[PDB]
Write a protein that binds this ligand. Sequence first.
Ligand SMILES: Cn1cc(-c2ccnc(-n3ncc4cc(C(C)(C)C)cc(F)c4c3=O)c2CO)cc(Nc2ccncn2)c1=O
Length: 265
Amino acid sequence: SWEIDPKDLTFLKELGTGQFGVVKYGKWRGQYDVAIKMIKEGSMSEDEFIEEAKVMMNLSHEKLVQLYGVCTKQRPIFIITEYMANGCLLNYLREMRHRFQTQQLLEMCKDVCEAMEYLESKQFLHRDLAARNCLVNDQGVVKVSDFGLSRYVLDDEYTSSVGSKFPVRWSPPEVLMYSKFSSKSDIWAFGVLMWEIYSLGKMPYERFTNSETAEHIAQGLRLYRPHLASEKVYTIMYSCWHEKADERPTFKILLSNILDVMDEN
Ligand SMILES: Cn1cc(-c2ccnc(-n3ncc4cc(C(C)(C)C)cc(F)c4c3=O)c2CO)cc(Nc2ccncn2)c1=O
């Protein structure tokens, strides 16, 4: 694991708080833009994370927000990542909602699908894929962030399937019923993410509670086709939501589907 020297980090701006506490924008060695997570004491299973961190750092792809390294020889520990100037995708969609062409929306789905095809090829699960966990850079490229970190969260409202922070609206039946995560549960979440993109950042199953969402999707309720999604695009997102995990596509198949739609248009 790349153990970064904290003396090489210059903090510049607050980026707000996430599940592990404060995140800052800064520079590494006075040049490279980075984000720095300051891991709040008690928020993370730190020994577990440190033991397993190298796998995460070896994930390298243009459409992943890279985990560059860690600072662990002190308290609090730091996680150092790629910086994304336009922030999270969910907010970006909502703030620019009157400016998007449908071709740009499909390009966002392609960006995320490329990242996920790469993770799938490495047998690595995101576990919390959603627009809130994608980020956008200064050139509008969407990248997938915080892949794999859900495993290390210490927060019972997040880790309990009936907790108020659990990502129920992005979860397939086998996660809600059995806590069975797989690349096929990331597939389901990706379909919901496509829906978030094409709805310009609406909340999935808005007005339903988490338990009502779970109850109704188990019985076959599915997200409606957003106005901006063509039938071809809807067919792609809908394919992610087969009740049976083994009937869902792979990210390799989804990427091929997405490219085919692009070529036709
Ligand atoms: C890399 N990065 C991270 C963030 C940023 C800031 C605050 N909290 C977070 N979050 N948000 C959510 C989050 C979620 C998780 C789960 C394990 C999946 C539950 C784990 C995290 F570690 C975080 C985190 O750190 C992030 C996401 O990691 C913001 C950026 N950019 C900007 C730009 C402008 N304004 C604000 N932020 C940026 O480039």
